[PDB]
Amino acid sequence: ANYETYDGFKVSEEPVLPEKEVHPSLWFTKSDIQKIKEKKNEDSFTAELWEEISNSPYLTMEIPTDIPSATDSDTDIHKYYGNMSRIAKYNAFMYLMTGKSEYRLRATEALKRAFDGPIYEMDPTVSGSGVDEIYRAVWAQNFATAYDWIQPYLSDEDDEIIRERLAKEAQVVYENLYTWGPRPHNHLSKPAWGLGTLALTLSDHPDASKWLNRALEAANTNTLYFFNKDGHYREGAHYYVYSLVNLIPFLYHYKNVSGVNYFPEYKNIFEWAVKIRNGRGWMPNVEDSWIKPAPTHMVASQYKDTDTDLHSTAKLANILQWSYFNTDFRPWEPDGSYTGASYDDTWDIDQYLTYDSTIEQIKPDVSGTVFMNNSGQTVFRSDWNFNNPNSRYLLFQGVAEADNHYHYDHLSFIIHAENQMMASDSGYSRNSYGEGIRTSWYLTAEAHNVITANGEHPKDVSENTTPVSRYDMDTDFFDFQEKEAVYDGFTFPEKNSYDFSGKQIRAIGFPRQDYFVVADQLFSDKEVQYDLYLHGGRGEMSGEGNYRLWTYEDDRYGQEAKMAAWVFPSKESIFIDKEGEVNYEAGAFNSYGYLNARQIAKDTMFMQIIVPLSKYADIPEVVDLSTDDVVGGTVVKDNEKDTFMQQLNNAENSLGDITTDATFAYTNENSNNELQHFSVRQGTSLDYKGENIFVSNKPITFALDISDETQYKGTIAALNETVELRVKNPVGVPTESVVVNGENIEFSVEDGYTVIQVAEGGDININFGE
Numbered sequence: 001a002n003y004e005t006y007d008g009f010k011v012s013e014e015p016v017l018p019e020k021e022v023h024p025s026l027w028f029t030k031s032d033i034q035k036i037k038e039k040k041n042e043d044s045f046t047a048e049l050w051e052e053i054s055n056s057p058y059l060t061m062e063i064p065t066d067i068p069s070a071t072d073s074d075t076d077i078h079k080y081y082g083n084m085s086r087i088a089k090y091n092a093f094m095y096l097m098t099g100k101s102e103y104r105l106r107a108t109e110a111l112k113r114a115f116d117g118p119i120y121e122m123d124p125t126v127s128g129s130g131v132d133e134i135y136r137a138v139w140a141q142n143f144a145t146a147y148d149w150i151q152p153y154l155s156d157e158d159d160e161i162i163r164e165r166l167a168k169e170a171q172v173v174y175e176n177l178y179t180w181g182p183r184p185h186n187h188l189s190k191p192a193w194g195l196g197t198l199a200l201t202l203s204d205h206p207d208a209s210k211w212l213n214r215a216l217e218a219a220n221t222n223t224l225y226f227f228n229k230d231g232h233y234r235e236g237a238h239y240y241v242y243s244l245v246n247l248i249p250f251l252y253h254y255k256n257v258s259g260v261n262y263f264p265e266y267k268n269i270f271e272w273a274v275k276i277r278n279g280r281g282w283m284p285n286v287e288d289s290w291i292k293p294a295p296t297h298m299v300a301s302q303y304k305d306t307d308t309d310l311h312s313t314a315k316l317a318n319i320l321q322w323s324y325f326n327t328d329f330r331p332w333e334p335d336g337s338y339t340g341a342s343y344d345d346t347w348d349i350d351q352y353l354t355y356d357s358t359i360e361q362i363k364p365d366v367s368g369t370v371f372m373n374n375s376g377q378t379v380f381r382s383d384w385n386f387n388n389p390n391s392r393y394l395l396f397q398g399v400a401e402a403d404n405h406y407h408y409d410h411l412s413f414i415i416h417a418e419n420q421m422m423a424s425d426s427g428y429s430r431n432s433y434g435e436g437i438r439t440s441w442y443l444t445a446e447a448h449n450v451i452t453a454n455g456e457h458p459k460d461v462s463e464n465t466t467p468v469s470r471y472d473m474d475t476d477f478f479d480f481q482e483k484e485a486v487y488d489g490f491t492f493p494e495k496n497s498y499d500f501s502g503k504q505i506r507a508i509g510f511p512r513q514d515y516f517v518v519a520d521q522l523f524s525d526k527e528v529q530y531d532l533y534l535h536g537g538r539g540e541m542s543g544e545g546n547y548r549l550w551t552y553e554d555d556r557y558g559q560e561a562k563m564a565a566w567v568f569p570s571k572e573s574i575f576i577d578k579e580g581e582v583n584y585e586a587g588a589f590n591s592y593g594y595l596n597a598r599q600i601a602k603d604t605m606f607m608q609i610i611v612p613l614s615k616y617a618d619i620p621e622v623v624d625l626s627t628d629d630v631v632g633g634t635v636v637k638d639n640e641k642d643t644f645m646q647q648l649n650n651a652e653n654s655l656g657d658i659t660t661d662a663t664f665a666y667t668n669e670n671s672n673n674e675l676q677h678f679s680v681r682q683g684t685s686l687d688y689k690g691e692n693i694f695v696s697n698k699p700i701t702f703a704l705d706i707s708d709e710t711q712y713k714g715t716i717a718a719l720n721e722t723v724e725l726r727v728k729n730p731v732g733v734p735t736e737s738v739v740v741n742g743e744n745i746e747f748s749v750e751d752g753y754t755v756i757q758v759a760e761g762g763d764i765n766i767n768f769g770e
């Protein structure tokens with residue numbers, strides 16, 4: 001695996017230290033302590049956080065006199081060091097907050113026994129090690145913080161004892177960082193940030209420069225490969241958070257101690273979380289990952305002067321704050337831990353220190369649909385509303401595969417709608433990484449909403465190159481994007497030769513921002529078996545033929561609802577009920593019916609119509625009108641008729657009322673059977689009930705709203721070259737102006753058609769008189 005060729009990001013590796021150690025300084029200085037003591041009164045959140053911190057059993061519990069030996073269990077060794085690190089930090093904090101004698105003495109004894117017992121005898125490279133580098137990252141930060149807090153009040157003797165213990169761990173971590181974490185996944189980054197904290201805490205120590213430098217260097221190999229520039233983490237949402245447990249602290253530590261502010265460079269990893277959040281603010285169960293909340297509140301404070309694409313006026317800080325507090329947290333009751341480190345972390349304290357009660361929660365005001373084509377994720381989204389059943393979310397997953405925690409999920413999609421999790425990724429595993437079932441089922445292509453060729457998963461053209469996106473279109477009435485993967489390309493584990501050569505072009509549309517069309521083009525040099533899979537998450541599957549219905553109940557993840565799906569072409573495909581597990585969090589696995597549609601063909605097409613519905617809503621009337629060269633049908637929902645059409649070539653063909661040369665075409669009618677909206681992929685003409693709507697001298701991709709006879713409005717997808725587009729005006733109405741990207745463009749009117757040269761795409765208004 002090549003760790004240098006992904007389009008990630010890195011920061012300066014130059015170790016900046018202060019002239020002289022100040023303690024405290026990691027989170028705050030001496031002056032701040034009374035403000036931080038007062039903070040508990042600001043609002044109900046700081047109050048609840050104080051209530052948790054000040055009743056911590058790590059204040060009262062007996063410091064254990066029983067040091068464990070090398071041959072004890074890996075759980076007990078873990079919990080010992082976890083507890084010792086926690087005693088030190090919780091007590092060092094409550095000393096600063098209350099001054100109580102007991103707290104300073106406890107913190108001091110715990111710090112004097114920091115990394116005592118068998119840790120340095122044991123081997124962290126051993127699988128399941130009780131002293132694994134991912135655990136002693138948190139320990140190192142817990143002990144370093146406890147010291148930074150209690151150092152002033154130590155004796156000269158105790159200071160030199162505790163400094164010798166921390167400095168040892170630091171040296172050990174420094175020497176074994178690249179041996180414990182030979183590949184640059186979160187097993188390298190987490191302890192590297194741990195070393196970073198230790199280096200800043202003991203800034204005066206002679207080796208602190210070497211320590212910090214390696215810490216930054218090691219972390220940069222994670223952010224270059226596993227992170228995209230646009231913020232995406234390729235180990236998925238669960239391991240992203242797991243990374244944040246050690247990253248967020250270090251980011252603050254290095255600003256507060258050395259005045260190196262990296263919060264601008266790491267900005268996107270927080271914006272990313274907000275862009276992929278579902279209706280209840282959960283990040284998706286994609287790759288080795290559960291559903292996750294994004295702790296964006298803990299960094300909101302640093303982005304008060306940062307602009308975002310997510311609001312017209314407001315600053316990122318207000319969106320980040322809105323995101324966390326507009327999350328359903330019920331999946332993490334009654335405990336409340338979503339970090340994964342619930343033996344080691346001090347999350348109540350770290351939240352208390354980083355939360356800003358002044359930052360106003362502002363909801364994003366832009367279009368919900370976002371295209372993050374660098375990483376290869378795309379979210380169709382009607383609105384930003386929290387816990388609203390009228391919301392529609394589809395994540396469209398097309399990200400270059402990484403060599404850790406990978407799942408075969410290229411051109412897959414998941415759906416959140418009617419407050420329930422519908423069309424599904426089958427999740428991480430039943431419980432853990434080491435289980436058989438994870439390799440045999442969970443990570444496999446068939447566990448996902450993909451199309452396989454002879455069982456082969458769609459994959460990257462070349463290692464660390466994002467699957468190509470085209471024809472991005474966002475509007476009020478129809479969104480659209482196509483992604484391209486190949487079957488005879490690059491994956492893990494590495495596979496060099498294939499019996500054939502083929503590709504998938506999967507387009508997804510968002511008709512009326514209400515339901516979804518998935519239109520697949522499949523090309524191959526040989527006859528092969530195409531297997532389409534559609535998982536309906538944790539639903540009771542019913543239906544016969546090309547139709548299926550997953551019915552959901554009030555569960556831990558959403559409300560009573562149902563998802564209806566139809567697959568075209570009916571007549572050229574067979575439909576196979578199957579049963580596979582779906583798991584959104586550790587331990588909660590269960591079997592649910594999923595559809596396997598199948599063709600044997602060379603070049604062919606599938607189309608899914610997928611419709612979220614409230615419990616008792618009418619099933620739409622869907623009619624397959626597929627023929628030899630044309631796949632598509634009609635949907636009659638809420639008294640309007642939509643018509644979808646796909647083909648493989650620019651050739652004039654017909655389906656229902658459509659006639660076009662376009663490789664894809666959508667049309668919407670109103671109650672009155674008048675064309676209201678339409679979109680085309682690479683068309684030069686569209687007719688509806690025999691009436692021409694537009695023509696062009698070259699192929700153009702665009703969507704247009706024609707319901708207002710005073711103004712036609714929509715968007716034109718990116719353009720390589722100048723196109724003469726000709727749109728038919730309402731009958732006996734002149735054109736007053738045409739606006740593309742807020743600029744007037746030159747227009748003539750010939751035979752009742754507005755005639756424009758368009759040299760770049762973007763939003764278009766055709767403004768009409770009377």
Ligand SMILES: [Ca+2]
Binds near residue numbers: 401408
């Ligand atoms: Ca993947």
Ligand SMILES: [Ca+2]
Binds near residue numbers: 367479
């Ligand atoms: Ca939109």
Ligand SMILES: [Mg+2]
Binds near residue numbers: 125126128132133
């Ligand atoms: Mg290990």
Ligand SMILES: [Mn+2]
Binds near residue numbers: 407409427428443448
């Ligand atoms: Mn998966």
